[PDB]
Amino acid sequence: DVTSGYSNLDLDLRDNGVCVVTLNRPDKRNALDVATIEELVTFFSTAHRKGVRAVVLTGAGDHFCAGLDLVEHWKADRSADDFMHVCLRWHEAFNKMEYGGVPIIAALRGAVVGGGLELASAAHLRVMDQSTYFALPEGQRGIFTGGGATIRVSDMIGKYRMIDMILTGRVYQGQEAADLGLAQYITEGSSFDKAMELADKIASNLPLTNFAICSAISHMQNMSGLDAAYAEAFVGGIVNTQPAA
Amino acid sequence: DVTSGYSNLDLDLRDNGVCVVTLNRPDKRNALDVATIEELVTFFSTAHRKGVRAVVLTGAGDHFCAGLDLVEHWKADRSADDFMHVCLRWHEAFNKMEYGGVPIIAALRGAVVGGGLELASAAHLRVMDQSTYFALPEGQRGIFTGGGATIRVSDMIGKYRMIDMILTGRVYQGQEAADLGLAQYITEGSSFDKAMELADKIASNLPLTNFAICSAISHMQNMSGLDAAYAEAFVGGIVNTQPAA
Amino acid sequence: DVTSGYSNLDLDLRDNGVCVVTLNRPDKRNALDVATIEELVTFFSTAHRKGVRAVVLTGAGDHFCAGLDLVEHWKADRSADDFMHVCLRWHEAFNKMEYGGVPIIAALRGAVVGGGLELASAAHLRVMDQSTYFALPEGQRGIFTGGGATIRVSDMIGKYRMIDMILTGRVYQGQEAADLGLAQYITEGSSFDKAMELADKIASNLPLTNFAICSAISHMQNMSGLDAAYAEAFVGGIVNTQPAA
Amino acid sequence: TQDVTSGYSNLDLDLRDNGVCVVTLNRPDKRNALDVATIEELVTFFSTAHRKGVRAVVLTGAGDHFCAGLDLVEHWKADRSADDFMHVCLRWHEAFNKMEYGGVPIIAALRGAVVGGGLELASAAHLRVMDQSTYFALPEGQRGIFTGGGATIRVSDMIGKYRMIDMILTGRVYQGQEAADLGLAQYITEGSSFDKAMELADKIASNLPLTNFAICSAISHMQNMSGLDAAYAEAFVGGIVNTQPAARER
Amino acid sequence: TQDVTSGYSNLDLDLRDNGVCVVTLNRPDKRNALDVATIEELVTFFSTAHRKGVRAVVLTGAGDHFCAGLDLVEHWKADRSADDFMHVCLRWHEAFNKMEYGGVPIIAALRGAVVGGGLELASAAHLRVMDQSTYFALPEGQRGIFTGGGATIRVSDMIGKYRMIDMILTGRVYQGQEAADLGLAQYITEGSSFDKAMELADKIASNLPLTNFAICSAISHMQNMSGLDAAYAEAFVGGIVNTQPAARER
Amino acid sequence: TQDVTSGYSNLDLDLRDNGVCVVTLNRPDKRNALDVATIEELVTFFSTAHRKGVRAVVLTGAGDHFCAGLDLVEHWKADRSADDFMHVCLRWHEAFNKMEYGGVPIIAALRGAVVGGGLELASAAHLRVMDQSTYFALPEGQRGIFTGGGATIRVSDMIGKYRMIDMILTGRVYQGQEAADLGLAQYITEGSSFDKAMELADKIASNLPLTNFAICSAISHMQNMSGLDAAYAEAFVGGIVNTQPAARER
């Protein structure tokens, strides 16, 4: 019951458990409105229990994701509390992606900007192609990132590089972007095909091992290394003694 | 009342709110004595409320800053508690810079060493030129960094690279230094002019947006990502619904 | 009484206080069994009080360390709690290395894989040669890292690169590995000789300064920067006012 | 509004006109022991309560005992591996995190046994009201069992780490005023804990939604941070909550 | 020494010969409500007290009530936006952080209302002395207001997160021995809280400056860290404090 | 089994047949003041107790007083520099960390003075049993000394940061039921604290080794984390402990 029914996500579940999840509004470069965020909360809250083994996340069209749907935003005439609540929903979706235990590999193309970079950062692995570029351009437009960029992008490229990106609108692309920490993989070919290659290999690993890799490590990074040491020992104890292992 | 009156800092407030703050003792490569640290505490404690929009921090002369004023130090014949108190003042100055909400862009030249690298690290952005080099040389002289290097330089280049720098006295310069994380910008020309270009653009952004960028992100990095998610939503709520925004 | 007596470690204490510590089972690429881990706990729990000034850690033979002794592991038929306890011993050894206050420089050759990369990560400095390669290959074999990789390797190369390494089994070597953060030094010659050069220089520094560098910095990185600021001031107060300093 | 009470099997739900929803465990025959299906219903209810418009929740257990803890019959029969049980524990934690950090005030009306996983459920509420029949314990420890539903976090936050360690290490039982004074419940009544909980809930429901949302989510987050970073976050929560038009209106 | 008492308008200051400085809120006509100008004077006083040589502070409010909290008249009139109010809250936090982490022992002599922002101010002191007229509350919540001056941090540290949530969610008032036992004040007197605070302050002022500095700054920092990292920092604080020549002299 | 009791000079050790080991400080002539050699023996004993098979420890001091704290005679004579003393403090911390996080339940049987470093030692135990002669204080502060053996961490966890600050800032002494209620000891007896500690230890020793190990190590680690990360770790501790064959057997 994985492909249940979603309006704003196109799903393709392959026989080995890899589910392609595609943002489906290329006419607006897949900008994320509140309904799409809720479908991401739902999908990533249930993916593990529904048996999904890995996810390849992509955006329909030439551009991965332009970020916050500004048309919806401007029209909603939001108060500070209304917008704070919208941001909590973005965070719920991305927390379910990051800490959910289902490996997520993003196949990037074109503009990975603003909230779109926040969505890409919620994946475990990112594959960029020759057309891909990254930025947090809204900062210069007076907009602060409220979907996790200050957390995940800093974890990806360093707090001072993330501050630079939002303070100046600086753009990164090509090898320079991969080397900075924006994506672990860069291809001269299809980022979708490379993501699928990675996803198929990951899906052939043990479910429990991938679950721990895709949830425990982020938690350990939130604590003192002297307390994470103890938690890591328990994670290794459970994962490495499973019959299948 | 920004250029009020300081003995150890030369100030130049431009019409757009950018304030150039220049260490003014080139004869001693701008080494930082206790009086200069107190003026940095005062300036950065009040800059935001005095209306400063951005700061370009520089050192008069060929060298940004040589660090701790050792002549004052040796002559003061400090006990462990006396020196601990001096370090707390350094930290107060740099905390007001980092968490104060006023964007600070350092225009580096020559030696950015020891406490001088600690001062540069307290800025949000760093611009280095072709003469700039970085080191924590005192470590080999038996001196531990007590002005935040263990915190900020580790945040800039990684804990293990910071440990290497103080343990061995290793020097970095050129593109290698920029790539390591010591400065986000490297220019073949004037680091002052490049810093001013960046500062003028930043000063044209909304005051509240820059305030959040230059205070909230450092705070979020000090907490678990699962708690920063909630705080970030409130920061976005306030910043993105301001009338000006 | 440094070279006391160990079965699984070969020790060579030099006249300047540098102790070479060599894993001594090249026939199994120095895989770490429980007895070797206990000797590492013992050696690194007492090295500082026994007067060791620096340690050069190496593996006998062409390969630094292959990781967990799988023959012992499979034969022990471990329950989840048995294995959790083994992981706590690995962590105790590596915590004594990291926070013990005695500088440790690892001279790497060949395969630095799995638990072997966890051991190398517990050193302060790493020197790699032209034959050195790094990986966490067990992940694809269903094995989770329970000896600190999720903590230290993430601190070395970034959480998302560490997740990539264990999720995919990706290998790094050469300049690419040094640049990623796996080793601060890469040599075209002998990694042992380069490690000794570094170690001899470090051993000529003050004992207290090296102790603080090799214990305080890791602790500061486990707290909010606003609380580490205060602790760092006390560390600087004690280190910088010692008579020898 | 939206339907709040339909579609559940393991929770009895009663939505009052002022937005207070009574959530009642409904298996007194097994002292409301929590099986995996009940935990999943708690996840669903507490993941959606705020957005559905629920203003406050009074949590109770049908019968003489609030909740005896994890359903051991189900546990025993399942012959769970360490990973299977770790997964069950993560679901308990998801339900309790949605209760604690969800922003909807929860007031537990306690009676009889509030033990093991039942004390973990009670600890996920913001307020607890106990009566003269109420008693508290973490007895599983004496049975070789560790608390995997938050007791080590929330009960420590309620009574102190060393008193929580004592309870699980020794099976020590607390009741009456001593239990209230220890930090196990903020309110103790000589009468009906349900009626006192409803009094508290009706007053809470009369306050502003955003103010209750912040009180019932932000404070727990602030306690997980250094006080020097929570200071900054609290200033932003105060800025949003205290300038809402409805607050000025008051 | 340096001048400590001059130049202020919203604080009455009295420096005694042994270094104890009485700091008194001086607007009893409005129950010492704290406006932005008073907060700024607290920032200035507590940012410089240690370096000026102040050995201890006895903090009090003129009149029958210590402090009723934020100045609502000023608040209402200012018609503040969320960002304007967030900025006001950061100033309150700066004043209270300089009190808590500044290294100068602060003993609050309480009387009457210690409510809302007034309880936040009292919580920024190291020690609190209450009298028989003293009462505590965070009533703003019932008025749709959230505490933005540290109550969620310090009052939780004083009485427990769940009792702090209770106070702001319900407006519950505490007084007398019950308040002292809850953790709202370490000392309760049947007489003058000011006189008891001065007794405590005079004894504290007789101890070594560095020892009091560490006690009144390091402990709060240690509580923001994992205990396994605070262990290391505490060893360095002990090393510096316990080997100062003056300590040996004792 | 392995030898547990031989080879020590500064600890009297008595291993009972059920695995409870009585560890007794043995210098009543100096009220069991802790010198560096005794701290090193505590490091050795508590670093190996779990692996040697010790099931629980009852910690006591010979004579009328549990422990008066750091050995000042040794301290004074050593004329320690700040770094020398910081190093001594790290050894105290290593001994107490091995006690707190080692996984072997420790029950302290207190009598008489539990002061300064002696309260730090007592605080490293999981449970404390006090008698009618027992009193607690951190008097060193009045003597210009700061606690460098964990009091700022563990005593704060026991009684609250503000009560710990009060104790060291003022030298305040606690005893009797007031001390127990404050959080200084979970058990108070009108009889023998040693006999009550042995009763508790014998019951604890009858429980499963792994369950006691987790209770006596995991909970302290969880309290050093955000509750949202401890939730995940606790689920893994529950998974391992609750599926061990011996637990099912129960």
Side-chain angles (χ1 to χ4, degrees):
Chain A
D1 63 349
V2 178
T3 48
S4 286
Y6 294 88
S7 292
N8 305 93
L9 303 171
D10 280 1
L11 305 179
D12 177 4
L13 178 64
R14 303 301 172 79
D15 304 332
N16 64 343
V18 170
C19 194
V20 184
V21 174
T22 303
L23 300 181
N24 71 7
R25 282 301 296 295
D27 52 304
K28 63 187 186 176
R29 295 187 175 188
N30 304 313
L32 304 171
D33 58 4
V34 167
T36 302
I37 290 298
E38 290 310 318
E39 281 179 355
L40 288 167
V41 170
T42 298
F43 183 84
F44 288 108
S45 291
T46 64
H48 165 66
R49 285 163 65 79
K50 288 188 176 185
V52 174
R53 302 300 320 291
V55 166
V56 167
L57 179 67
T58 206
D62 301 323
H63 299 287
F64 179 71
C65 180
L68 184 81
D69 183 326
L70 299 179
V71 177
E72 173 179 80
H73 183 58
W74 167 280
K75 292 158 60 172
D77 188 26
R78 295 171 171 147
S79 56
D81 48 306
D82 291 334
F83 193 67
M84 172 275 296
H85 276 300
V86 168
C87 291
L88 292 177
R89 305 310 298 166
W90 278 64
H91 276 101
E92 180 70 12
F94 301 163
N95 283 345
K96 288 294 188 275
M97 289 173 66
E98 180 176 5
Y99 298 89
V102 179
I104 303 167
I105 304 86
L108 311 177
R109 303 179 48 177
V112 179
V113 294
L117 172 54
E118 291 178 311
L119 171 69
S121 74
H124 303 94
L125 303 184
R126 285 158 289 286
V127 181
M128 63 179 290
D129 70 8
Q130 300 302 298
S131 73
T132 304
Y133 62 93
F134 303 91
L136 295 173
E138 303 87 346
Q140 292 189 298
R141 175 57 197 173
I143 299 312
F144 189 87
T145 52
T150 69
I151 301 163
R152 300 186 175 86
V153 179
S154 294
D155 286 345
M156 287 158 58
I157 64 174
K159 134 190 175 183
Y160 290 99
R161 292 188 184 86
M162 181 276 144
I163 285 168
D164 178 25
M165 286 187 74
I166 189 174
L167 196 54
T168 69
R170 186 176 187 171
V171 180
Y172 288 104
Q173 65 193 42
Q175 191 67 48
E176 186 183 15
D179 289 350
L180 204 78
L182 290 158
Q184 299 98 326
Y185 295 89
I186 175 168
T187 179
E188 290 282 350
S190 171
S191 62
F192 179 81
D193 292 336
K194 176 60 177 183
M196 285 300 311
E197 168 201 289
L198 292 167
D200 289 339
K201 185 192 217 187
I202 288 167
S204 79
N205 201 339
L206 297 179
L208 177 63
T209 309
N210 284 337
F211 177 80
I213 291 172
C214 295
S215 54
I217 302 174
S218 286
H219 276 121
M220 305 298 93
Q221 284 291 296
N222 290 326
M223 50 202 55
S224 164
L226 289 167
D227 297 299
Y230 185 94
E232 201 205 65
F234 275 78
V235 177
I238 291 191
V239 178
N240 300 174
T241 63
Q242 53 182 125
Chain B
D1 63 349
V2 178
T3 48
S4 286
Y6 294 88
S7 292
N8 305 93
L9 303 171
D10 280 1
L11 305 179
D12 177 4
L13 178 64
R14 303 301 172 79
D15 304 332
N16 64 343
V18 170
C19 194
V20 184
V21 174
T22 303
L23 300 181
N24 71 7
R25 282 301 296 295
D27 52 304
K28 63 187 186 176
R29 295 187 175 188
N30 304 313
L32 304 171
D33 58 4
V34 167
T36 302
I37 290 298
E38 290 310 318
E39 281 179 355
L40 288 167
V41 170
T42 298
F43 183 84
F44 288 108
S45 291
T46 64
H48 165 66
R49 285 163 65 79
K50 288 188 176 185
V52 174
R53 302 300 320 291
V55 166
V56 167
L57 179 67
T58 206
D62 301 323
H63 299 287
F64 179 71
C65 180
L68 184 81
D69 183 326
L70 299 179
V71 177
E72 173 179 80
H73 183 58
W74 167 280
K75 292 158 60 172
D77 188 26
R78 295 171 171 147
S79 56
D81 48 306
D82 291 334
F83 193 67
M84 172 275 296
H85 276 300
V86 168
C87 291
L88 292 177
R89 305 310 298 166
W90 278 64
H91 276 101
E92 180 70 12
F94 301 163
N95 283 345
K96 288 294 188 275
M97 289 173 66
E98 180 176 5
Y99 298 89
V102 179
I104 303 167
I105 304 86
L108 311 177
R109 303 179 48 177
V112 179
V113 294
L117 172 54
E118 291 178 311
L119 171 69
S121 74
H124 303 94
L125 303 184
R126 285 158 289 286
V127 181
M128 63 179 290
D129 70 8
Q130 300 302 298
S131 73
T132 304
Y133 62 93
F134 303 91
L136 295 173
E138 303 87 346
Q140 292 189 298
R141 175 57 197 173
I143 299 312
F144 189 87
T145 52
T150 69
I151 301 163
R152 300 186 175 86
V153 179
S154 294
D155 286 345
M156 287 158 58
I157 64 174
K159 134 190 175 183
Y160 290 99
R161 292 188 184 86
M162 181 276 144
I163 285 168
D164 178 25
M165 286 187 74
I166 189 174
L167 196 54
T168 69
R170 186 176 187 171
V171 180
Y172 288 104
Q173 65 193 42
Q175 191 67 48
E176 186 183 15
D179 289 350
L180 204 78
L182 290 158
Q184 299 98 326
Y185 295 89
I186 175 168
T187 179
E188 290 282 350
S190 171
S191 62
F192 179 81
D193 292 336
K194 176 60 177 183
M196 285 300 311
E197 168 201 289
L198 292 167
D200 289 339
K201 185 192 217 187
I202 288 167
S204 79
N205 201 339
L206 297 179
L208 177 63
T209 309
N210 284 337
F211 177 80
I213 291 172
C214 295
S215 54
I217 302 174
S218 286
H219 276 121
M220 305 298 93
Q221 284 291 296
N222 290 326
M223 50 202 55
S224 164
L226 289 167
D227 297 299
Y230 185 94
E232 201 205 65
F234 275 78
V235 177
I238 291 191
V239 178
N240 300 174
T241 63
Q242 53 182 125
Chain C
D1 63 349
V2 178
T3 48
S4 286
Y6 294 88
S7 292
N8 305 93
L9 303 171
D10 280 1
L11 305 179
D12 177 4
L13 178 64
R14 303 301 172 79
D15 304 332
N16 64 343
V18 170
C19 194
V20 184
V21 174
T22 303
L23 300 181
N24 71 7
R25 282 301 296 295
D27 52 304
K28 63 187 186 176
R29 295 187 175 188
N30 304 313
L32 304 171
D33 58 4
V34 167
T36 302
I37 290 298
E38 290 310 318
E39 281 179 355
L40 288 167
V41 170
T42 298
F43 183 84
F44 288 108
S45 291
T46 64
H48 165 66
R49 285 163 65 79
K50 288 188 176 185
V52 174
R53 302 300 320 291
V55 166
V56 167
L57 179 67
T58 206
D62 301 323
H63 299 287
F64 179 71
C65 180
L68 184 81
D69 183 326
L70 299 179
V71 177
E72 173 179 80
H73 183 58
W74 167 280
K75 292 158 60 172
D77 188 26
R78 295 171 171 147
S79 56
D81 48 306
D82 291 334
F83 193 67
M84 172 275 296
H85 276 300
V86 168
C87 291
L88 292 177
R89 305 310 298 166
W90 278 64
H91 276 101
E92 180 70 12
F94 301 163
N95 283 345
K96 288 294 188 275
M97 289 173 66
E98 180 176 5
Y99 298 89
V102 179
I104 303 167
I105 304 86
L108 311 177
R109 303 179 48 177
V112 179
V113 294
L117 172 54
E118 291 178 311
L119 171 69
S121 74
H124 303 94
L125 303 184
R126 285 158 289 286
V127 181
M128 63 179 290
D129 70 8
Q130 300 302 298
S131 73
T132 304
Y133 62 93
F134 303 91
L136 295 173
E138 303 87 346
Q140 292 189 298
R141 175 57 197 173
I143 299 312
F144 189 87
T145 52
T150 69
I151 301 163
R152 300 186 175 86
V153 179
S154 294
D155 286 345
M156 287 158 58
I157 64 174
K159 134 190 175 183
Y160 290 99
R161 292 188 184 86
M162 181 276 144
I163 285 168
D164 178 25
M165 286 187 74
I166 189 174
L167 196 54
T168 69
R170 186 176 187 171
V171 180
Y172 288 104
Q173 65 193 42
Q175 191 67 48
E176 186 183 15
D179 289 350
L180 204 78
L182 290 158
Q184 299 98 326
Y185 295 89
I186 175 168
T187 179
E188 290 282 350
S190 171
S191 62
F192 179 81
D193 292 336
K194 176 60 177 183
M196 285 300 311
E197 168 201 289
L198 292 167
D200 289 339
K201 185 192 217 187
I202 288 167
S204 79
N205 201 339
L206 297 179
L208 177 63
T209 309
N210 284 337
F211 177 80
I213 291 172
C214 295
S215 54
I217 302 174
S218 286
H219 276 121
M220 305 298 93
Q221 284 291 296
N222 290 326
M223 50 202 55
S224 164
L226 289 167
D227 297 299
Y230 185 94
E232 201 205 65
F234 275 78
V235 177
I238 291 191
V239 178
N240 300 174
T241 63
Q242 53 182 125
Chain D
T1 189
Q2 309 166 56
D3 182 302
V4 170
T5 63
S6 313
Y8 294 87
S9 301
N10 303 58
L11 298 175
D12 280 3
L13 304 166
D14 173 4
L15 181 70
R16 304 299 171 81
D17 292 347
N18 64 342
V20 171
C21 191
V22 184
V23 174
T24 303
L25 301 183
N26 67 11
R27 287 296 301 283
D29 57 299
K30 55 176 181 179
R31 293 187 178 197
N32 302 314
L34 304 170
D35 53 12
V36 296
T38 301
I39 290 301
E40 287 310 320
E41 285 194 358
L42 289 167
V43 171
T44 296
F45 186 86
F46 289 107
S47 291
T48 61
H50 167 69
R51 283 173 302 144
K52 288 196 182 182
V54 175
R55 301 302 316 289
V57 168
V58 167
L59 179 65
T60 206
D64 298 329
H65 299 290
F66 178 72
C67 180
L70 184 135
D71 184 334
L72 300 180
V73 171
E74 174 181 78
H75 185 60
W76 172 270
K77 292 176 125 293
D79 199 12
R80 296 177 171 141
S81 58
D83 49 306
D84 298 327
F85 194 64
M86 169 280 293
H87 275 301
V88 168
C89 289
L90 292 177
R91 303 311 298 164
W92 278 62
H93 275 102
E94 176 72 7
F96 300 166
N97 284 344
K98 287 292 189 274
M99 289 171 68
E100 175 177 11
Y101 300 88
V104 177
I106 301 165
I107 305 90
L110 311 173
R111 299 184 67 190
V114 177
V115 301
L119 172 53
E120 290 178 314
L121 172 65
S123 74
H126 304 93
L127 305 183
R128 284 157 290 287
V129 181
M130 58 179 292
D131 69 8
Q132 304 299 299
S133 71
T134 304
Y135 62 96
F136 301 93
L138 294 175
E140 62 267 81
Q142 294 272 64
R143 178 167 21 186
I145 295 318
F146 189 83
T147 52
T152 68
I153 300 155
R154 300 188 175 84
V155 178
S156 294
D157 289 340
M158 289 157 57
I159 66 175
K161 161 177 96 167
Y162 292 102
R163 292 185 172 157
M164 182 273 147
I165 286 170
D166 180 24
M167 288 187 72
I168 191 171
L169 192 61
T170 69
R172 186 174 186 171
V173 180
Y174 285 104
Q175 63 192 62
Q177 190 69 48
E178 185 181 15
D181 292 347
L182 201 76
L184 291 158
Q186 300 98 326
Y187 294 87
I188 179 164
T189 179
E190 294 280 352
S192 167
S193 59
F194 177 76
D195 288 340
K196 174 67 174 172
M198 288 296 314
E199 172 200 278
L200 293 167
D202 287 342
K203 183 186 286 192
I204 287 161
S206 76
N207 292 319
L208 298 179
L210 175 66
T211 306
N212 282 342
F213 177 83
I215 289 171
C216 294
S217 54
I219 301 173
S220 286
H221 275 121
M222 304 298 102
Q223 287 291 112
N224 289 326
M225 300 175 193
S226 163
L228 291 165
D229 299 297
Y232 187 91
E234 199 203 67
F236 277 77
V237 176
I240 293 198
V241 179
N242 303 179
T243 62
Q244 55 181 132
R248 192 179 174 75
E249 195 70 304
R250 290 206 184 181
Chain E
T1 189
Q2 309 166 56
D3 182 302
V4 170
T5 63
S6 313
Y8 294 87
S9 301
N10 303 58
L11 298 175
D12 280 3
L13 304 166
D14 173 4
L15 181 70
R16 304 299 171 81
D17 292 347
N18 64 342
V20 171
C21 191
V22 184
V23 174
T24 303
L25 301 183
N26 67 11
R27 287 296 301 283
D29 57 299
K30 55 176 181 179
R31 293 187 178 197
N32 302 314
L34 304 170
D35 53 12
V36 296
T38 301
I39 290 301
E40 287 310 320
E41 285 194 358
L42 289 167
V43 171
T44 296
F45 186 86
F46 289 107
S47 291
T48 61
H50 167 69
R51 283 173 302 144
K52 288 196 182 182
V54 175
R55 301 302 316 289
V57 168
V58 167
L59 179 65
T60 206
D64 298 329
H65 299 290
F66 178 72
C67 180
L70 184 135
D71 184 334
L72 300 180
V73 171
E74 174 181 78
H75 185 60
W76 172 270
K77 292 176 125 293
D79 199 12
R80 296 177 171 141
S81 58
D83 49 306
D84 298 327
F85 194 64
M86 169 280 293
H87 275 301
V88 168
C89 289
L90 292 177
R91 303 311 298 164
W92 278 62
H93 275 102
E94 176 72 7
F96 300 166
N97 284 344
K98 287 292 189 274
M99 289 171 68
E100 175 177 11
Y101 300 88
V104 177
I106 301 165
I107 305 90
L110 311 173
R111 299 184 67 190
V114 177
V115 301
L119 172 53
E120 290 178 314
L121 172 65
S123 74
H126 304 93
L127 305 183
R128 284 157 290 287
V129 181
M130 58 179 292
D131 69 8
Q132 304 299 299
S133 71
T134 304
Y135 62 96
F136 301 93
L138 294 175
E140 62 267 81
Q142 294 272 64
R143 178 167 21 186
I145 295 318
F146 189 83
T147 52
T152 68
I153 300 155
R154 300 188 175 84
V155 178
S156 294
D157 289 340
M158 289 157 57
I159 66 175
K161 161 177 96 167
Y162 292 102
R163 292 185 172 157
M164 182 273 147
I165 286 170
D166 180 24
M167 288 187 72
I168 191 171
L169 192 61
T170 69
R172 186 174 186 171
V173 180
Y174 285 104
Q175 63 192 62
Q177 190 69 48
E178 185 181 15
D181 292 347
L182 201 76
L184 291 158
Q186 300 98 326
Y187 294 87
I188 179 164
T189 179
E190 294 280 352
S192 167
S193 59
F194 177 76
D195 288 340
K196 174 67 174 172
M198 288 296 314
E199 172 200 278
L200 293 167
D202 287 342
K203 183 186 286 192
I204 287 161
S206 76
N207 292 319
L208 298 179
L210 175 66
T211 306
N212 282 342
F213 177 83
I215 289 171
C216 294
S217 54
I219 301 173
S220 286
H221 275 121
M222 304 298 102
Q223 287 291 112
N224 289 326
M225 300 175 193
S226 163
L228 291 165
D229 299 297
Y232 187 91
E234 199 203 67
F236 277 77
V237 176
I240 293 198
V241 179
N242 303 179
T243 62
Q244 55 181 132
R248 192 179 174 75
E249 195 70 304
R250 290 206 184 181
Chain F
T1 189
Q2 309 166 56
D3 182 302
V4 170
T5 63
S6 313
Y8 294 87
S9 301
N10 303 58
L11 298 175
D12 280 3
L13 304 166
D14 173 4
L15 181 70
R16 304 299 171 81
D17 292 347
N18 64 342
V20 171
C21 191
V22 184
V23 174
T24 303
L25 301 183
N26 67 11
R27 287 296 301 283
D29 57 299
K30 55 176 181 179
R31 293 187 178 197
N32 302 314
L34 304 170
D35 53 12
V36 296
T38 301
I39 290 301
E40 287 310 320
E41 285 194 358
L42 289 167
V43 171
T44 296
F45 186 86
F46 289 107
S47 291
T48 61
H50 167 69
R51 283 173 302 144
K52 288 196 182 182
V54 175
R55 301 302 316 289
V57 168
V58 167
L59 179 65
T60 206
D64 298 329
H65 299 290
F66 178 72
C67 180
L70 184 135
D71 184 334
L72 300 180
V73 171
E74 174 181 78
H75 185 60
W76 172 270
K77 292 176 125 293
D79 199 12
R80 296 177 171 141
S81 58
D83 49 306
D84 298 327
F85 194 64
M86 169 280 293
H87 275 301
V88 168
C89 289
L90 292 177
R91 303 311 298 164
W92 278 62
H93 275 102
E94 176 72 7
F96 300 166
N97 284 344
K98 287 292 189 274
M99 289 171 68
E100 175 177 11
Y101 300 88
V104 177
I106 301 165
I107 305 90
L110 311 173
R111 299 184 67 190
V114 177
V115 301
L119 172 53
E120 290 178 314
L121 172 65
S123 74
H126 304 93
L127 305 183
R128 284 157 290 287
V129 181
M130 58 179 292
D131 69 8
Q132 304 299 299
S133 71
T134 304
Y135 62 96
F136 301 93
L138 294 175
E140 62 267 81
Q142 294 272 64
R143 178 167 21 186
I145 295 318
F146 189 83
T147 52
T152 68
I153 300 155
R154 300 188 175 84
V155 178
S156 294
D157 289 340
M158 289 157 57
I159 66 175
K161 161 177 96 167
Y162 292 102
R163 292 185 172 157
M164 182 273 147
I165 286 170
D166 180 24
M167 288 187 72
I168 191 171
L169 192 61
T170 69
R172 186 174 186 171
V173 180
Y174 285 104
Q175 63 192 62
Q177 190 69 48
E178 185 181 15
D181 292 347
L182 201 76
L184 291 158
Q186 300 98 326
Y187 294 87
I188 179 164
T189 179
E190 294 280 352
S192 167
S193 59
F194 177 76
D195 288 340
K196 174 67 174 172
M198 288 296 314
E199 172 200 278
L200 293 167
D202 287 342
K203 183 186 286 192
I204 287 161
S206 76
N207 292 319
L208 298 179
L210 175 66
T211 306
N212 282 342
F213 177 83
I215 289 171
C216 294
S217 54
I219 301 173
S220 286
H221 275 121
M222 304 298 102
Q223 287 291 112
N224 289 326
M225 300 175 193
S226 163
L228 291 165
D229 299 297
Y232 187 91
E234 199 203 67
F236 277 77
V237 176
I240 293 198
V241 179
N242 303 179
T243 62
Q244 55 181 132
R248 192 179 174 75
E249 195 70 304
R250 290 206 184 181

